[PDB]
């Protein structure tokens, strides 16, 4: 059911100058089959030494506004100034050895990097983020003492003080795999300011809890087993091809159970058949010719029940155009047992123009919140919807026209963009195209999420706080920019109501506390990669609910891009079921209990959905009601000049690893 009249006589032309530099790229856009294709010309200007000085997307060339980027290079070809129209201006200075010395980002924050002196090998020592002067990072290197060589610590960064605390490294294997590390966190009333020489006045800024984790690895450096920070041990086994074939978990004080008892693979190393300690068998089918995933068949071999069977169809180029489920509808939807077919169509640039699927009945309009679960008692159904998307010539999603018949909830939602930038907010915030760039930082990070919500950002462009009305939610990040803390402070009932999550290797320490006491303490043991059928274990140390049982195993079952759609217990019964709108909004949401729905945190593309609605994708935050990122691309023009675009506006076939 693919129509090739969309793609006739629409090639991609890269026009060259007399130096064979790509000075124009040419695209032809046909949205529907009968009409003519539209030539889009992206312009790249080069100076006389041959570096790309300015680049211009085809929408701002029609506006007669300036270029997207204005770069200034040195004589070697490295960028000294980059005046991006979405990410602001970046002034970068490197030394002789091409190490960064001075970085000024668009918010005016000067970053320093001081190194070792000329008698030492010149490794990194400290980083200073001057705004008024903070030594925000501090690296402690090791020597070649025979105590250091016993643990292979020679020439490593043993203590690494960063924006979230301390990351101490204890032992290395003979390959170079870290076998033991520990980490403390900065306290809530303190920021990273690691000034001075003595480290005894840096431990009074850190927490008392030192979270150490341990590993064991084979001679090939693959991780065999891993002890968490509490003592829960995961243990993996490998087959003769070096792939992974098994998994065992032993909680602290308990025996060793089985999480994955078999995992076979195809010839190309893709997953082929996997049986869990649940007992449920999933089986992946592939194309012979192209080795594309054409089937995910989740079968429970105790009732001969197929829980889901997703058969994918594709374009010739590899765009998902048809997903049908040959399973029956679950126990949450009474009186119906046929799952509708999801059909997708695309433009000539392979961006999603239309999408059908199923959604709940009492969902209403899509927003930042997720709807209430469909319990097995309230006998509710699902209905059919179809969404149609519209784009401008910069690739920004400008309009989602959700038209759902048989319920009369037909709504459109517009994204109001700038004329000079790709910065565009929802139409609830501003209807004027000229007051959109007042809602962003100078670096292009959005500063207001909703009409009553404001966002605060770090000096290095990371989300520091989502201010709601009465209750904020703030985060902390390490030197790589990965989130190590999430503290949700609800307003005053008689005191603050604080929920704290600590992100550790293979462990989430979700805890809830009032004024003086902890009212809930939850240790989520994770097994595997999120989006790769992850298994979670919810262990309650304090404040367990009445109806749930302790050490509850939640086996996640994922679709093509990793959206967690089915959760099963250790016996194989369904805990919670979810479907998604194509750009990530929760369309269908059924659960066994309301309190068993509160602990599903990883939802779409294997990414954790916060209480603010934003998905945390690594280096950036994503907002699914708009299909935009919350900030500009931190890496730059990796994927085109649109720094705010989603996955080439192709969110069914593609998915973004880690945001950047």
């Amino acid at each position: 059911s693919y129509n090739s009249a969309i793609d006739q006589k629409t090639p991609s032309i890269k026009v060259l100058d007399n130096r064979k530099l790509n000075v124009r790229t040419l695209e032809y856009l046909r949205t529907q089959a009968d009409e003519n294709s539209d030539e889009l010309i992206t312009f790249y200007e080069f100076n006389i030494p041959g570096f790309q000085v300015k680049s211009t997307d085809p929408r701002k060339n029609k506006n007669q506004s300036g270029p997207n980027f204005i770069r200034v290079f040195n004589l070697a070809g490295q960028v000294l100034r980059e005046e991006s129209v979405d990410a602001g201006r970046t002034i970068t200075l490197n030394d002789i050895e091409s190490r960064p010395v001075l970085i000024i980002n668009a918010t005016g924050v000067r970053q320093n990097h001081r190194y070792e002196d000329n008698t030492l090998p010149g490794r990194l020592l400290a980083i200073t983020e001057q705004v008024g002067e903070k030594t925000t990072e501090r690296l402690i290197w090791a020597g070649n003492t025979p105590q250091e060589k016993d643990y292979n610590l020679a020439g490593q960064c043993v203590r690494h003080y960063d924006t979230a605390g301390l990351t101490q490294l204890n032992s290395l294997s003979l390959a170079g795999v870290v076998l033991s590390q520990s980490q403390q966190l900065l306290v809530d009333d303190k920021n990273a300011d690691w000034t001075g020489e003595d480290q005894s006045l840096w431990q009074q800024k850190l927490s008392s809890d030192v979270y150490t984790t341990q590993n064991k690895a084979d001679a090939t450096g693959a991780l065999l087993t891993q002890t968490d920070a509490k003592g829960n041990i995961q243990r993996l086994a490998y087959d003769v091809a070096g792939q992974l074939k098994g998994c065992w978990l032993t909680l602290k004080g308990q025996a060793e159970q089985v999480i994955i008892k078999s995992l076979t693979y195809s010839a190309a190393g893709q997953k082929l058949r996997e049986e869990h300690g649940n007992g449920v068998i999933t089986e992946y089918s592939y194309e012979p010719e192209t080795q594309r995933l054409i089937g995910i068949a989740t079968r429970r071999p105790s009732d001969a029940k197929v829980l889901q069977d997703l058969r994918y169809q594709y374009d010739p180029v590899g765009n998902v155009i048809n997903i049908r489920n040959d399973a029956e509808a679950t126990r949450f939807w009474r009186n119906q047992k046929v799952v509708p077919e999801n059909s997708y169509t695309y433009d000539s640039l392979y961006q999603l123009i239309s999408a059908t699927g199923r959604e709940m009945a009492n969902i209403g309009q899509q927003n930042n919140q997720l709807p209430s679960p469909a319990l097995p008692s309230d006998n509710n159904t699902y209905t059919n919807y179809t969404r149609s998307y519209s784009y401008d010539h910069s690739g920004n999603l400008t309009q989602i026209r959700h038209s759902s018949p048989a319920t009369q909830n037909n709504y459109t939602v517009a994204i109001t963009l700038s004329n000079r930038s790709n910065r565009g907010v929802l139409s609830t915030l501003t209807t004027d195209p000229n007051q959109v760039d007042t809602l962003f930082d100078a670096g292009g990070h959005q500063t207001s999420l909703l009409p009553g919500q404001t966002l605060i950002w770090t000096p290095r462009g990371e989300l520091k706080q989502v201010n709601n009305g009465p209750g904020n939610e703030w985060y902390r990040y390490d030197s790589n920019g990965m989130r190590q803390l999430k503290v949700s402070e609800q307003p005053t009932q008689n005191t603050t109501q604080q929920q704290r999550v600590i992100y550790l290797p293979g462990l989430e320490l979700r805890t809830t506390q009032s004024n003086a006491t902890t009212t809930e303490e939850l240790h989520v043991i994770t097994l595997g990669e999120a989006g790769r059928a992850q298994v979670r274990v919810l262990h309650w140390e304090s404040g367990k609910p009445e109806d749930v049982n302790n050490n509850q195993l939640r086996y996640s079952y994922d679709n093509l891009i990793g959206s967690s759609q089915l959760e099963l217990d250790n016996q194989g019964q369904i805990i919670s079921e979810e479907e998604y709108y194509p750009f990530g909004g929760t369309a269908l949401w059924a659960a066994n209990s309301q309190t068993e729905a509160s602990y599903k945190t990883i939802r779409y593309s294997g990414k954790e959905r916060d209480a603010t609605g934003l998905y945390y994708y690594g280096y950036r935050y994503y907002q699914p009601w708009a299909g935009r990122w919350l900030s500009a691309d931190p890496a730059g023009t990796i994927d085109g000049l649109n720094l705010y675009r989603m996955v080439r506006n192709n969110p069914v076939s593609l998915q973004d690893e880690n945001g950047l």
Binding site: L244, G269, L293, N480, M482, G531, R532, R648, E657
Partner: peptide, 16 residues
């Protein structure tokens, strides 16, 4: 960066 479905990559249980 926008990559394809998760099935293409090798398994990874522990990294940074």
């Amino acid at each position: 960066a926008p990559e394809k479905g998760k099935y293409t990559k090798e398994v990874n249980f522990f990294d940074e």
